Amino acid sequence: GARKGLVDTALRTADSGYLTRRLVDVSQDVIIREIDCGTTRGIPVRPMTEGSKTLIKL
DNA sequence: TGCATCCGTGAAACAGAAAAATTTTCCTGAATTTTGTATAAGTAGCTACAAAAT
C-alpha cells in the first residue's frame, strides 16, 4: 500500500497545481467593479441532503 | 462516416605563398610651459623724522 500511496503522491501534487493554474486563468479577472449592477433575480438554495442525511444545514 | 492511426501536448595539411595587417619609429610639430622678460606703475613698504607723555 504504502508504496502505492507514495508514488501517487508524487503525482497528484502537480495535478493540483495544474488546476488552479487553469482556474485562475479561466477565472482570473471577475473583479468587483461595480455596485450599480441591477436585476432582482437569483437562485434558490436548499440544504444538501443526500438521503435523509442532510449534508449542510441550510 | 465513427472510426483506423496517429501528430506531439501537457504534464584533420601544407608549402608555398603571398598580403596583409601592425607596429615599432619617427617625427614631428605642434602645441603647449616657463620664464624670462620684460613691463609700469604704484607702494607699501621702508626708513628718520618731530614734538610732546613715558
Swiss-Prot record:
At the top level, the lineage of the source is Bacteria
Q: Which residues of the full protein are shown?
A: 183 to 240 of 1355
Described purpose of this protein according to its UniProt entry: DNA-dependent RNA polymerase catalyzes the transcription of DNA into RNA using the four ribonucleoside triphosphates as substrates.
Subunit structure as annotated in this protein's UniProt entry: In cyanobacteria the RNAP catalytic core is composed of 2 alpha, 1 beta, 1 beta', 1 gamma and 1 omega subunit. When a sigma factor is associated with the core the holoenzyme is formed, which can initiate transcription.
- Of which family is this protein a member? Belongs to the RNA polymerase beta' chain family. RpoC2 subfamily.
Q: Provide the protein name.
A: DNA-directed RNA polymerase subunit beta'
Task: Identify the residues that bind Zn(2+).
Answer: 37
From the broadest rank down, the organism's phylogenetic lineage runs: Bacteria, Bacillati, Cyanobacteriota, Cyanophyceae, Nostocales
